[PDB]
Design a protein around this ligand. Structure first.
Ligand SMILES: CC(=O)N[C@@H]1[C@@H](O[C@@H]2O[C@H](CO)[C@H](O)[C@H](O)[C@H]2O)[C@H](O)[C@@H](CO)O[C@H]1O
Length: 70
C-alpha cells in the first residue's frame, strides 16, 4: 500500500479540495467518499485530495498519496 512518499496524484478530485487536520483526517474523508479510491494528502499545505479514476503520479516533495485503506 502507498502512503508516505513524494508522489502526488494528478487526477481529478471528487469535490472541493479542503484541508485536513492530518493524514488520517484525509483518510477518514476518503472513507466517506465512495468514489475516493485514493487520497493525496499534501503535507506541504495540509490539503486533502479525495480523488477518483486513474492516478497520475508525479514527483513532488510534499504530496503523499494513500491507497485509501491500509
Ligand atoms: C502545489 C503544486 O503546484 N502542485 C502541482 C500539481 O497541482 C496540484 O497539486 C496538488 C497538490 O500538490 C494536487 O495534486 C492537485 O490535484 C494538483 O492539480 C500539478 O498537477 C503537478 C503536475 O506535475 O505539479 C505540482 O507541482
Amino acid at each position: 500500500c502507498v502512503h508516505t512518499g513524494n508522489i502526488g496524484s494528478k487526477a481529478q478530485t471528487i469535490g472541493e479540495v479542503k484541508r485536513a487536520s492530518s493524514l488520517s483526517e484525509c483518510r477518514a474523508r476518503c472513507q466517506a467518499e465512495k468514489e475516493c479510491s485514493h487520497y493525496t494528502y499534501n503535507v506541504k499545505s495540509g490539503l486533502c485530495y479525495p480523488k477518483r479514476g486513474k492516478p497520475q503520479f508525479y514527483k513532488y516533495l510534499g504530496d503523499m498519496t494513500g491507497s485509501r485503506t491500509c
